[PDB]
Amino acid sequence: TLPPSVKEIAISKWGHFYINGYNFFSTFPIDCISFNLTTSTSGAFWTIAYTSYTE
Amino acid sequence: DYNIYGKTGIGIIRQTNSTLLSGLYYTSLSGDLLGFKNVTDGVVYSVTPCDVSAQ
Ligand SMILES: *[C@@H]1O[C@H](CO)[C@@H](O[C@@H]2O[C@H](CO)[C@@H](O)[C@H](O)[C@H]2NC(C)=O)[C@H](O)[C@H]1NC(C)=O
Numbered sequence: 001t002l003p004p005s006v007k008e009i010a011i012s013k014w015g016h017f018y019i020n021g022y023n024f025f026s027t028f029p030i031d032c033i034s035f036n037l038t039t040s041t042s043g044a045f046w047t048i049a050y051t052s053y054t055e
Numbered sequence: 056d057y058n059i060y061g062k063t064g065i066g067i068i069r070q071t072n073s074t075l076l077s078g079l080y081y082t083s084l085s086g087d088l089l090g091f092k093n094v095t096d097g098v099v100y101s102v103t104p105c106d107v108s109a110q
């Protein structure tokens with residue numbers, strides 16, 4: 001079930017899903033990701049970040 | 056005797072009011088399980104030893 005306190009969903013190109021920082025499931029390596037989302041209770045702005053690993 | 060998310064031990068498990076926004080379970084510096092989160096409602100439970108050192 002969806003817990004009431006999800007605040008970030010991170011998807012890696014190798015198929016790993018992180019919810020709130022913890023890897024809960026891994027699929028096969030992903031080539032492309034289609035999404036279509038909308039929300040109204042996310043204050044004023046919510047962000048989608050494309051990120052690369054760094055130390 | 057608990058087996059929680061693969062970590063096993065002997066202890067007393069209690070429900071806390073604390074709100075930790077990240078992670079599934081927490082360990083000490085020695086690697087002992089200290090707390091874990093219920094994935095349905097987000098409640099955090101603490102784990103304590105059944106017996107302690109005395110003088
Ligand atoms: C997600 O919701 C939380 C609240 O549940 C938002 O954080 C609050 O933002 C308001 C508006 O700036 C502040 O007054 C509160 O103090 C914040 N609560 C905190 C920090 O606990 C948060 O902005 C929302 N996130 C998104 C992306 O919309």
Ligand SMILES: *[C@@H]1O[C@H](CO)[C@@H](O[C@@H]2O[C@H](CO)[C@@H](O)[C@H](O)[C@H]2NC(C)=O)[C@H](O)[C@H]1NC(C)=O
Nearest residue numbers: 001059068070092093094095096097098099100
């Ligand atoms: C995690 O939390 C859920 C939600 O509170 C717990 O499921 C509840 O269990 C009680 C006792 O059987 C039922 O009365 C409730 O109706 C359940 N709520 C649900 C299903 O939403 C669940 O037991 C908790 N998990 C653990 C391991 O304690």
Ligand SMILES: CCCCCC/C=C\CCCCCCCC(=O)O
Nearest residue numbers: 001002003005019020024076094097
């Ligand atoms: C892609 C839509 C959302 C994915 C749904 C996944 C299903 C269950 C969520 C399990 C992770 C729960 C983490 C607890 C988060 C928290 O309460 O802080």
Ligand SMILES: *[C@@H]1O[C@H](CO)[C@@H](O)[C@H](O)[C@H]1NC(C)=O
Nearest residue numbers: 069070071072073074098099
């Ligand atoms: C924790 O929750 C219980 C039950 O609501 C309450 O009686 C207790 O005072 C709370 N403890 C703290 C430190 O808030």
